[model samples]
Target: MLDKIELFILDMDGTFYLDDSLLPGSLEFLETLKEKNKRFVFFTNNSSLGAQDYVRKLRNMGVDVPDDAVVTSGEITAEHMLKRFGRCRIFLLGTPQLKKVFEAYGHVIDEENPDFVVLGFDKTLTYERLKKACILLRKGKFYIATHPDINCPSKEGPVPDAGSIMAAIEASTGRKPDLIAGKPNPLVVDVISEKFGVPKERMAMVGDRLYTDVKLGKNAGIVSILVLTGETTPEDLERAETKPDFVFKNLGE
Candidate 1:
């Protein structure tokens, strides 16, 4: 399996590690990658944190990775905003951490007269924010969501994510996201290939979800590997239209 792949792309929350708990041989697999000088990248739909933050967290947890080795849907969205909208104001429905990423790009985080509205996995989402987002989006502001993932795996249980927000926004404003920046969208894969200089054919995506994670690679011509650590299981894969090329018991074996 390693012989055909030049680079490995992994999802964070469910596939690689869940919260602070390491997934099975996650540590061992990382060590193996380092020993073999195999390049890997952590690409997450969770945009609440930046690459630098993830690098620190992974290193602290005994993973050999760098800031440049991590990419998030939030980061991609921020970069996309800069390229597409220049310096427009945004009404962001995301974590405070996610808000910082957009602010770092010099976008004003305003709810009024927003040039666009962006949604993320806001664990701290509130009714007030939802009201404001609906108002702004109804006013015809461009709307972009980080992912269409319905649920986020937490140590406690599954929690509502950006996709849930999309549902509410659709219900209230009669609108859906103008674009979803995460998996299944060719944009994220395009950025990864451009940044790593790795062709889509030589890159592989490892994740638990058949919808977002696997479909991202399949839509982009990259190999997709599914892990059983979080979300989808063997039974779930049977009904999924976007089945993975390879399935692992966990991150290790």
Candidate 2:
């Protein structure tokens, strides 16, 4: 299955490295890709950090890649909004890193009367921000989230992510997001396809998460390769409705 693949879309946190420690065969995997003349790009649903942030972090970890080689949900959201809504006002509930990306896209960040409410993984969330987001969402403003990930795996444990915040707002406003700009959504695949000029059929999504990464491949009509180095386990796969096309114990294998 891997032999015919022209491109690989990798998930970051779990698939490549766990915290500061690089996973086994991660760097070697890239070298192998280059040797085989196959292209690869790293995609992350964590919208708290942008592409440049990952570039810096990856460089520090001895994995050097060009700026365009990395894509973040925050960047994807910004591009999606620009094309669909132009420079409309948006109420963004995200970190400072995400804010810069939206601003750079020329979207006005209005907390009072935004046309849409954009949500991202905000580690620095506050009650006041949550209150404002709920109020705006309840007021009938369209809601969009960067991704649907419920939790982000940490070295310590699972941490509440954007989906958790989305859940809270949904409870208050009785509204679900109109659009999500991350994995498992065709929007992500479309962006990658157009940017890299690789058809979905020839691409493969490699990651540790089932709901996002593996499901994304299925949704996009691509190859899904699940690695058990992160969020998923063999036991979890038994009951999972969404299964990957292939499974590896780790990227090294």
Candidate 3:
């Protein structure tokens, strides 16, 4: 399956590294891709950090990439919101870093009144803001989300991600995101495909998570490769409804 793949879309936190340390064989994986003349780009669903931050982090890890080589769910959401809503007030739930991304796109980040209730991976989540977001949902504001990964894999363990926060809002307000502009949706794929001029058939999504990464391959009509170095265990793979085209212990295989 990889023989047909010209581009490999990777997941960062769990797939390449866990926290600050790079996963085993991660550096070798990139080297192997270059050796084989295959292209790879890190496309993470983690909206907590912007692309530049990820670039800086990866550079520290010994992998230097261009600005366009690292893509984030935050950027995709910001661009999509601007195109669809055409500059609107957004009640965004994210970190200060992510806030700057939306602002850069010219979207007004409003807490009191907003046309949309946008949610991302907010590491600084508080009960007060959660309640406010719920109230906004109840007020019939349109809901949007950066990604739908329930938990983000960490060096310690699985941590709550954007989907978990969205679950909280859904529990209180009985609402889910109207538009989720991340993996398993064609939004990210479209952006990448157009930017690189790569055909969908020649692309692959490689990650550990089944729902976001593997399912993205299925939805986008590309090959999927599941690596065991991240969130998914062998048992989880056996019970999964959506399966990847290939499986590896890490990127080395």
Candidate 4:
């Protein structure tokens, strides 16, 4: 079944490693992909880090992947804004790392008056930032979110992520995002597909999360492979509405 796949879009964090440590068979999985002449890229819905940061982290872990092999929700958000808003100013609520990504893409980071309000996995979030975002959103500014992941898997446990932040803003402002640019959103698939020039039918999305990872495959018309090495358990699969084409304990298996 795996032999038919030409490209593998992988999820980071839970799918690859836990915190800073690589998971069992993770290195071996890459070796196998190379041996099989298969292509793979690490795609993460986490918007807290940029592509270069991810590359650096992967390199530190001895993965030694190039910059183009890593993609993040932050980069996807930047690409979305670049195509849609162009040179418009955006009020972004994100970490300094994410800010650099938006800025590098030539979007003005203006809080006073912005054409849009972009939300990300802001680990450095504060009441002041949330207050400002809500105020701008109330003024009828457009809203964009990096991803919809409520909890980010970690060595410690699941931590509050971008979806949780958006939920709070939604409750306060009674408004939801006009656009979300990450996994399962179709835009992420379009961007990645175009970038890699791979047909959706030949691509496989591998990850532990059903909502973002497996759902992305289902929505994008690609093969989905669910691994239990991350947030998902066998019981979760029984109850999930979105099902993967294949299931494994880990990629190494």
Clashes (candidate 4): 0
Candidate lDDT values, in order: 0.76, 0.82, 0.80, 0.81
Q: Which tens-of-lDDT digit does each residue in 108-127 have in candidate 3?
A: 98787799988999998899
What TM-score should be assigned to candidate 4?
Answer: 0.90
Q: Model 3, stretches more than 4 Å misplaced?
A: 231-253
- lDDT at 61 for candidate 1? 76
| Greater-lDDT candidate between 3 and 4 | 4
Better of 3 and 4 by TM-score: 4
Tens digits of lDDT, candidate 2, 53-146: 9999999989879999999998899998899889979988999999998998899898878999899998878999989988887788888999
Prediction 2 TM-score vs. true: 0.90
Local error of candidate 1 at 62, Å? 2.1
Task: Report the error of model 3 at residue 250, Å.
Answer: 11
In candidate 4, list every pair of residues with a backbone clash: none
Q: Residue 26 lDDT in model 1?
A: 73
Per-residue lDDT over 1-253 for candidate 1, one digit per residue giving the tens place of the 0 to 100 score? 5356667887776667767766676776766666666678888887767777788888887776667889989888888888877876888888888888888888888765678888998877899999988888778989899878887777778777888778888999999998888888988888888888988777777777766676677678777776666656555432222332223322332
C-alpha lDDT (0 to 100) for residue 251 of candidate 4: 43
Backbone-clash count (model 2): 0
TM-score on alpha carbons, each prediction: 0.87, 0.90, 0.86, 0.90
User: Candidate 1 — what's its lDDT?
Assistant: 0.76
Residue 154 shift from truth in candidate 4, angstroms: 2.6
